[PDB]
Design a protein around this ligand. Structure first.
Ligand SMILES: *[C@@H]1O[C@H](CO)[C@@H](O[C@@H]2O[C@H](CO)[C@@H](O[C@@H]3O[C@H](CO[C@H]4O[C@H](CO)[C@@H](O)[C@H](O[C@H]5O[C@H](CO)[C@@H](O)[C@H](O)[C@@H]5O)[C@@H]4O)[C@@H](O)[C@H](O[C@H]4O[C@H](CO)[C@@H](O)[C@H](O)[C@@H]4O[C@@H]4O[C@H](CO)[C@@H](O)[C@H](O)[C@H]4NC(C)=O)[C@@H]3O)[C@H](O)[C@H]2NC(C)=O)[C@H](O)[C@H]1NC(C)=O
Lengths: 190, 230, 106, 125, 190, 230, 190, 230, 125, 106, 125, 106
C-alpha cells in the first residue's frame, strides 16, 4: 500500500499549515518550523526521507499524547502502523545504494535552503553519506543549485495558480476583446 | 464560450481587486469604442450517500455486529462464522486437530481461510493451550480462552484481532478495562467462532468487508518463531 | 471451587406467612444462582434463575434477590403446595454445585 | 414441549457398571448441557456431570475416575456409565437439560427440563 | 505496491468519463452519477476512502459480469485482488484514529457538495464517526467550506489549463508584441 | 523563441476561435502600425519496440513456454527448472523429505527458493499426500498430483500458482474445463518440477521475469494453519 | 510501499534527462532514447508497465556494473529489491484482466508516437494481447489518438508552465496597468 | 499586491528577454500617459538539521553501533538486545528450546518479537544446527554459528540480516572478505544476541529505528519450506 | 543402438530367491521405466514390475509381497528379486526398456528394447 | 485396474490374406494400446504403439486403429514370417497389463 | 579482590567418585569460563574442563566419559565430578577463572584468578 | 586440535642473564598464547596474555612476542625469584590446551 498518516496541526503561527520540529526532536535543541508549501509536498511524494521521518515523529507525539503511555513499549503498535507512516522501499533504496557503493541516506542529517530575508525554506533533503562520512558540500552543490532554481520557479508559478483560482478566464477574454475594440475604434478617428 | 462561464460565477469573484479593475477597464474601453437545506457559498448544497455493502456479498466476506456479544462474518448468502464473546465455554479439552481436519477435507474452504487469517493475525500468540478446536464432520468450532500488565497476554492479542476482524461494531464489547498503549481488556472469558447459516444479523452495524480486507495484510506480521526451520 | 451453604436447615411456617431462604457462596459467584423446589416422588422443579427471574408456570409469589455471595428466595404468602425442600444451585465453567438444601414444613 | 425419556436397569450388585441413558424429545440438542444428577437416600442433590453436543464433558471430582458420560447426536441421546458401583451409589438418578447464559452480566444457569428419574440400588440380595 | 484497478465505463451520459453508483449500490435505491473531474482524482489520490470503495464495487460488478458466478465464494479471488483495489494503509489510518479517540471513517457514509444549478459535484468524503455516532455537521463545517472553496478555484483553474492546451504561448506573445507596436506607432501621429 | 514554436504548430490550432481572433488582431495591429506507416494527427508516426528480457538473466529468473506441456524457469545461463504438465508420473511414493534435503545442503539454493515460493503461493493447500518429492544428491524433483466442486481442490490451487509462475504461454494448457469464478481445470493428472540445464526452450512465449516477481507477493497469503504455534 | 528506484543518467545527448534503451535491451536491436518529458512521468505514475520495465532494466545494468557479478545468481538480491523497482499490483492488474477475458499487457511489446520532424516521443504504452495474439491497431486507435492529443496539449501547457517560472505575475500586472493608463490618457487628447 | 512581490525578485528575472520587453513597454506607456555561510543564488543560505531519533524510544526500537564488535537495539529506557560479533561462543550445545520458552512465557514479549523478526528475515536459512539458544528464566540468548562460494552459506544470510538490523555502523564489521553480488563475509565465527539493560552505547552511530522498520517487510520473504503443510 | 544384457542363475530349488540383473548400454537411463516381464510355459506375457531412475517402482499385485526391483544408476543396471519361489514361478524372464508419453492425447506406452530372456525353472532335481 | 481381452483366441489364415485382431479393454483406456509380435526362441517385438504408429523396422503392412475400449491390429497382406503370437498391452499409471494373446497360424 | 575457595575430600579409594566445589567471591559470575585444571605428580598442567553461567561446558576428551562439571549461579559456585577414579587421577586440582577475548584480533584467553588447590590421592591404604 | 610444544625442556641460567622460552603450535593459533609461572606449593601465576601483554603485578622484565605458530617469552634480566616452571597455554573454542612446560633453574 501507500502511506496515509496526516501531520498534526502545526504549533507555529509563522507556518499555519506547516510543521514544527521542537527542540526535543533536534540534536541542537531548538524549534524549526517549515511552511505549508514544503510540508504539502510530503502529502504526495514517495521518495522523500524527511517526509517519512516527519510522519514517524508526528505519530510518536500523537501516540504518547492520546494513549496511556508507559515504560513497557507496545511492539504491536508500531509493527502495525509502520507502513501507514513510511515507505519501506525508501529504506530499501538507501540499502541498495549502500551495498552498491553509491552515496546513500542514513536518515540523520538534512539540508535545506533558507531565504535570508523572507525566511522561506525548501523541503529538507537527506545529507548523503559514503565511506563512513558525510558528503562534502561541493560534491552535491549541483543538487543544491537545482533546489534554489526550483525555489524561484515554483514561487513564481504559485502566484499564477492562485491567480487562476480567483480571476475567471472569461474576464481576461473580455478585457482583451474590449482593448481590441478600443484599439480598432481609435483608428477611425485618425 | 468562457464569457458565459464568467457570467454565471459573478457573485464569488467580485471581492478581488484585480477582477474589479479588469471589469472597469473593459467597460471604459467599450464605452470609448462606442464614442469613437445546507447551502455553502450560496450555491453548493451539502448532500450525502450511504453505500450498500451487502451487494458485495458474492465476492468478499461481510462482517457486522448484532449486539455486544454476537458478531458475524458472512460469506455469500448461505454460510458464515458467528463470533461470540462469552463467559460460557463450549469446549473443555486442549486439542486442536488441524492436521486431521485438513486430511479429512470436509470443512468449507472459505471459512477455513478466514479462521487461518484470524489466527495468523494475532500478535505474539504463545500459549497453544489457550486455543481449542473441534472440526469433526467438517464443522468449524474454535475457542480462545481469554482468562489470565494486560499487554503481554493472549487475551489482548486475540481481542486486537477480533476488533479488527469485526471492525465497526466491535468497540461496544471492548475498551471496558482501559489499558496501556493500544491494549484491550474485556470482562469476557472466551471468544468462540462457529460456522453458521446466513441470516440478517446486522442490527448494530452495517455489513462491511473492511475488517477482513484490512486483516489480510496483518497475516504473519507478529507471529513468534517456534522452531529454527519454519 | 464455589460452594453453597443454605440457611437455615428447616423452617416451620404457617400458610400465609413469609418464607425467606438464604444461600451463601464461599466466594463471589461466577453466575447468579438458581432455585429449585422438590417434593418426594417427583423431579425437582426450576423456580428461579438469574437470582430474580421466574421460570415458566411459576406463580408470582416466588421471588428472588441477591448478588456477590448472598442470595435469597422469598415466598410472599406460601400456599399449602409450597411446602417442599428447596435447593440453590451455582455453575462455574463446567462445574455445577448444589446447596445442601432447606426444608419448609408446616 | 420437551420430554427426557430415561432408561436403564436399576437393579445391580456391587462392582457392576450402572448404565443409564436419556433420550430428548423436543427442541434442539445443541446449545444445552445435558446433565446427570443424583439424590442419595437421606441426602441432597448431587451433580454427577454434564456433556454438550460437541462431546465436551464436566464431571464431579469425587466421581471422575469412575464416571463416563457420552452422547449420540443421531437419536439425541446421552448416557451415563458408573463403574465399580458400591453401596454409596444407591440413589435416584435424574437426567436434565441445562442452559447457561454467559453473554451478559448477570450470567445465569439453570436446569429447566428434568427426566422422571430412575431408582438405583446396589446390594448382595 | 499501489492500487491499479481502472474503473469501468460510466453508466451515465451526463458524466462521460465519470462513474455511476446504481440504485443497488446505495442504501436509498436510486442512481447517483459523478463527473470526470471528481472521478479522475481517484486515479492518483492515496487517501480517499470513496475511491477505494468505487474500485471495490467496480471489481465486484466486473467479476460477476465476466466470470461464471456462483453462490460458493472464491475467497482466493478477492484475497489476491484486494491490494490492486484498495490501500490497506487507509484502513490502517482509520483504525489508528479509532484507537486514539480521533474521529474516523467507517466507510458507510459520505458527503459531497452539489451545485444547485449546474449539478457538478465534489468528490464524496467520508462522514466521520466518534463515540458511536456520526459527527454533527457543525463539527466539520470548516472541511465543507474548504471543499466549496476548492470547487471554485479548481473550476477556474481548469478553464486556464484547457486554454493553455489550445492557444500557443507564442501566439499570446505575438499579440502582445503587435499591440505594443500599434501603441508605439499611434504616439508618433499625435 | 516561442514565436517559432507557434509557427511550427500552426495546423493544429486554427479551429480555436480565440487563436483566430488573436491572429486577426495581431495582423490588424501590425498593419495599422505600418500605416502610421501509421500517421496520427498528420504528424505523429506510430512506432513500436519489444524488450529483450533475456538480458536480465544474470539477476532474475526468466520463465517461458515451449508448448502446452513443457515450460521453464531459467536461472542464469547454466540452470533452471523444467515444469511439465503430464499424465505420466515419475514418483510413486508419498514422501517429501525436505528436512533431510536441508540438512544435506546439496541443492541449488536459488532453485530451492523458487520451489519454496511456488509451494507457499498455492491457495488453500490441505492434502499433503498430493505432493511428492525427491532431493537425493541435491537434485530437485517435485510432483503435484492433480487427480480428484473444482474450486476446492488441490488441482485448482496448484494450477493457479502454475499459471502465474509460467505467465505467458501457460494459458494454452489451461482452462480447458472452464470453471466457476477464477478456478482452473485441465486434463493433466500431474505437475512435475525438475531441475534442468540451460537451453533455449522459449518457442511459444518470450522469456520473462514477470510471473516470478508477481508471485513473490503471493507467498503465504493463502496458506492454512496446521498447528497453533507456527 | 511504493517504488523508489531512480533511473541512472542517460546515454544520449539528445535526451539529457531521458533514458536510452541500448542495442541489447531491444529485440530488433537498435538504440532508442526517450526524452526527459516522457521519462519524468515514470517518477510519479503507478500504472505504466513501461516505467516498471525501465526500472528493472536499469537495476540489472547497475547491479552488473557495481557488484562483482557471477554466473551464480543471487536470487536474494532481486527478491529484496523487487518492490523498490516495480508495482506488483500492476502485474496483478494484468493478471486479473487476463482471467476476465479483458485484453492485457504481457510486458513484451510497446507502442509510442514519434514526431516525424522534431523526434519527440510519447511514453511507450504496452501493446495489449488477447486470445493469444496482439490487438490489431484498429482495436485501440482511440487510445493512440488520445495520446497524440495529449502530446500536443502537454507541449503547449509546458510552454506556459516554464514561462510562469521566469516571468513574475506582478510584471504582467504592471504591464496591463501601464497599457490601461496609456489607453486612458490617449482618450483625453482626442 | 503582486507588484511588490515582483519588485522583490528583480535581480533574478532581468536575464529573460520577455521580462525586459515588458518592463520597457510599461515604462514607455507610463511616460506617454504622463505626457498626456553558504549562499546560493545570492539569497539562499544553506542550512542543516539533525534529527534526535532518541525521542522515539517510547514507541519503537532504536539500533546503534558501539564499535566493530558490539551493536545494540534498545526498547524503551530499560531493556534491549546486545548483538556481538565474536570468535568466543558462549553456547556449546545444539538446542534451541523455543516451544518450552513459549510455554513458560517468562521472556520480554518485545524482545522475543525482535528475535523472531531477525530470524524470519534471514534468507535461505537451512542448517538448524547453526543456531543455538538459551531461554531459561526468561532471558534471551541466541547464538548463530558463522563457520563454514560464500553466497550459499548460513554466514552470508545471517550477516545480511545483521547488517540491515544494525544499519548504520554495521559496515565497519562487514565486507572484510568481499563477495560476489551482495554477499557478505567477515572474520567472525559467531553472532550472539543477548538481552541487556539500558545504557548509552551509541559511540559509533546515532540511534535509529530505520533498520528494524525496514526488516519488518523482510519477514518470511526468503524462508524455505520444511514441510508440505507448514 | 541399445542392448539390455541379463545375468543371473536360472537353476533354482523351491523356497530359494531368484536374483536377475539387467545392464543397459545405449542411450539415457532416465526417462524410461525399466521393466521385468515373464512368460510361464503354456501362458502369455506377464508384467512383473518396473522401476525408473528415481527408484520409484510399480509391481504386479499378485506378486507384490515377494517381488523387489532395484536400480544402480552408477553402472546403469536394474535388478529383480523374487523370494520363496515355487513351481508357479518357472518362466522365461525378460528385462525391457519402457517409454511412456503422457504430455498430449492420445497418451501411449511401449516396451521397445528387450533383453534376450533367461529361462528359470524350480524343481527338486 | 484395466484388463485386456483379445479376440479371437486363435486365427487360421493363408499368406496374402487380411489379418484382423481385436483387443477390448474393461474400461476407457488410460493410454492407447500397443501391439507386440512374439515367436518361440526370441523376445517379443514391438509392432505398433499409440494404437496406430509403426515402430522402427516394422513393415508398412502392419497397421492399427481404435479408441475408447476397442482397438484392432491389421495385417493387410500377411507374409509367411507374420505367423506368431500377438499381444496387446496397456499401461495405467505404474501398472502395466497384457492381453491374453492371439495365436496367428497358417 | 577475587577469591576462589575450594572444597572437597581428597582421600579416595579406587572406583569412587571425586567431588570438588569452588566458590567465587568477587566480581561477576557471567562472562567467565570457570575452569578445572590438574597437575599429576611428575607431570605438567592438564586442562580438565570448563563451564560458563549458561551451563555450557567443554571437557578434555581423554576424561570426557567420566567427567561432569556443573554450576550453581544462586551461590556462585561450580563443581567437578570425576567417576571411577584410578591411580592415574592422583593430582593437585585447581579451579580457576578464565577469560576469553574474541571481539578483535589478536584474540586471547587466560586464567587470571586461581584457587589454592586440593591434593587428591587415590589408593587402597 | 591445537597442541603446544615448548622449547627447551630445561634452561640453566645465572641471575641477571636473559631467559628465552619458545612455544610452537601444531597449526596457526586460534588465539594468542598465555604464559604462566608455577612454583611448588602454590598455584600458577598468569604472566603474559595475548602473547605480549603483562598481567597485573607482573614486572616489566617479563615480555612476550610471536604470532602464527611461534611464540616466545622473554625475561630480560632474571632475578632469583624467576626460577620456576613456565607453561604456555592456548584455547580454541571450548578446548584449552597446555604446553608440557619448561624448567627454568640456576
Ligand atoms: C506476449 O504475447 C505475444 C503474442 O501472443 C507473444 O508473442 C509470441 O512470441 C513467441 C516467442 O518469441 C513467438 O514465437 C516465435 O516465432 C518465430 C517465428 O516463427 C514463424 O516463422 C518461422 C520462420 O521465420 C517459421 O519457421 C515458423 O514456423 C514454425 O512454427 C509454426 C507455428 O508458429 C509451425 O506451424 C511450423 O510448422 C513451424 O514449426 C513460424 O511460421 C520464431 O523465430 C521463434 O522460434 C525461434 O526462436 C526461439 C527463441 O529463440 C527458439 O526457441 C526457437 O527454436 C526458434 O529458433 C529457431 O528455430 C528454427 C526452426 O527450427 C531453427 O532453424 C533456428 O536455428 C532457431 N534459431 C534461430 C536463432 O533462428 C518463436 O517460436 C510467437 O510467434 C509470438 N506469437 C504471436 C501470436 O505473435 C509473446 O511471447 C508474449 N510475451 C510474453 C513475455 O509472454
Amino acid at each position: 500500500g501507500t502511506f496515509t498518516w496526516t501531520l498534526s496541526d502545526s504549533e507555529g503561527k509563522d507556518t499555519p499549515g506547516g510543521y514544527c520540529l521542537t527542540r526535543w526532536m533536534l540534536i541542537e535543541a531548538e524549534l524549526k518550523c517549515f511552511g505549508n508549501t514544503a510540508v504539502a509536498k510530503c502529502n504526495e511524494k514517495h521518495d522523500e526521507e524527511f517526509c517519512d521521518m516527519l510522519r514517524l515523529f508526528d505519530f510518536n507525539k500523537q501516540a504518547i499524547q492520546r494513549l496511556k503511555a508507559e515504560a513497557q513499549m507496545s511492539i504491536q503498535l508500531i509493527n502495525k502502523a509502520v507502513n501507514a507512516l513510511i515507505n519501506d522501499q525508501l529504506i530499501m533504496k538507501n540499502h541498495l545504494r549502500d551495498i552498491m557503493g553509491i552515496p546513500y541516506c542514513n536518515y540523520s542529517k538534512y539540508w535545506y535552503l533558507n531565504h535570508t530575508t523572507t525566511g522561506r525554506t525548501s523541503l529538507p533533503k537527506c545529507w548523503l553519506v559514503s565511506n563512513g562520512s558525510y558528503l562534502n558540500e561541493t560534491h552535491f552543490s549541483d543538487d543544491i543549485e537545482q533546489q534554489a532554481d526550483n525555489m524561484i520557479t515554483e514561487m513564481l508559478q504559485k502566484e499564477y495558480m492562485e491567480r487562476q483560482g480567483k480571476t475567471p478566464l472569461g474576464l481576461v477574454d473580455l478585457f482583451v476583446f474590449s482593448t481590441s475594440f478600443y484599439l480598432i475604434s481609435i483608428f477611425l478617428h485618425l | 464560450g468562457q464569457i458565459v462561464t464568467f457570467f454565471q460565477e459573478v457573485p464569488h469573484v467580485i471581492e478581488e481587486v484585480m477582477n474589479i479593475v479588469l471589469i472597469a477597464l473593459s467597460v471604459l474601453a467599450v464605452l470609448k469604442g462606442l464614442y469613437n437545506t445546507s447551502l455553502y457559498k450560496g450555491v453548493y448544497e451539502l448532500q450525502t450517500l450511504e453505500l450498500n455493502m451487502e451487494t458485495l456479498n458474492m465476492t468478499m466476506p461481510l462482517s457486522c455486529t448484532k449486539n455486544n456479544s454476537h458478531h458475524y462474518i458472512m460469506v455469500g448468502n448461505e454460510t458464515g462464522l458467528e463470533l461470540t464473546l462469552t463467559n460460557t465455554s463450549i469446549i473443555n479439552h486442549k486439542f486442536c486437530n488441524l492436521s486431521d481436519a485438513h486430511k479429512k477435507n470436509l470443512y468449507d474452504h472459505a471459512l477455513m481461510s478466514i479462521i487461518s487469517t484470524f489466527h495468523l493475525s494475532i500478535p505474539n500468540f504463545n500459549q497453544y493451550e489457550a486455543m481449542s478446536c473441534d472440526f469433526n464432520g467438517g464443522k468449524i468450532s474454535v475457542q480462545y480462552n481469554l482468562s489470565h500488565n494486560h499487554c503481554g497476554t493472549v487475551a489482548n492479542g486475540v481481542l486486537q484481532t477480533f476488533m479488527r476482524m469485526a471492525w465497526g461494531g466491535s468497540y461496544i464489547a471492548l475498551d471496558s478495562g482501559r489499558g496501556n498503549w493500544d491494549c484491550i481488556m474485556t470482562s469476557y472469558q472466551y471468544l468462540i467462532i462457529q460456522n453458521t447459516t446466513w441470516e440478517d444479523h446486522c442490527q448494530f452495524s452495517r455489513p462491511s468487508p473492511i475488517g477482513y480486507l484490512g486483516l489480510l495484510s496483518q497475516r504473519t506480521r507478529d507471529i513468534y518463531i517456534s522452531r529454527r526451520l519454519l | 471451587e464455589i460452594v453453597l451453604t443454605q440457611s437455615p436447615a428447616t423452617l416451620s411456617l404457617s400458610p400465609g406467612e413469609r418464607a425467606t431462604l438464604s444461600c451463601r457462596a464461599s466466594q463471589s459467584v461466577s453466575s447468579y444462582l438458581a432455585w429449585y423446589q422438590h417434593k418426594p416422588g417427583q423431579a425437582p422443579r426450576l423456580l428461579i434463575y438469574g437470582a430474580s427471574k421466574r421460570a415458566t408456570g411459576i406463580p408470582s409469589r416466588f421471588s428472588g434477590s441477591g448478588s456477590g455471595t448472598d442470595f435469597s428466595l422469598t415466598i410472599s404468602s406460601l400456599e399449602p403446595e409450597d411446602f417442599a425442600v428447596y435447593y440453590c444451585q451455582h455453575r462455574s465453567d463446567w462445574r455445577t454445585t448444589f446447596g445442601q438444601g432447606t426444608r419448609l414444613e408446616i | 414441549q420437551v420430554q427426557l425419556q430415561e432408561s436403564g436397569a436399576g437393579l445391580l450388585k456391587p462392582s457392576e457398571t450402572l448404565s443409564l441413558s436419556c433420550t430428548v424429545d423436543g427442541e434442539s440438542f445443541n446449545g444445552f448441557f445435558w446433565t446427570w444428577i443424583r439424590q442419595p437416600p437421606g441426602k441432597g442433590l448431587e451433580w454427577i456431570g454434564e456433556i454438550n453436543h460437541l462431546a465436551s464433558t464436566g464431571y464431579n471430582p469425587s466421581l471422575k475416575s469412575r464416571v463416563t458420560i457420552s452422547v449420540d447426536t443421531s437419536k439425541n441421546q446421552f448416557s451415563l456409565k458408573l463403574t465399580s458401583v458400591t453401596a454409596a451409589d444407591t440413589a435416584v438418578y435424574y437426567c436434565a437439560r441445562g442452559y447457561s447464559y454467559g453473554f451478559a452480566w448477570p450470567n445465569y444457569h439453570y436446569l429447566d427440563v428434568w427426566g422422571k428419574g430412575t431408582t438405583v440400588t446396589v446390594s448382595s440380595a
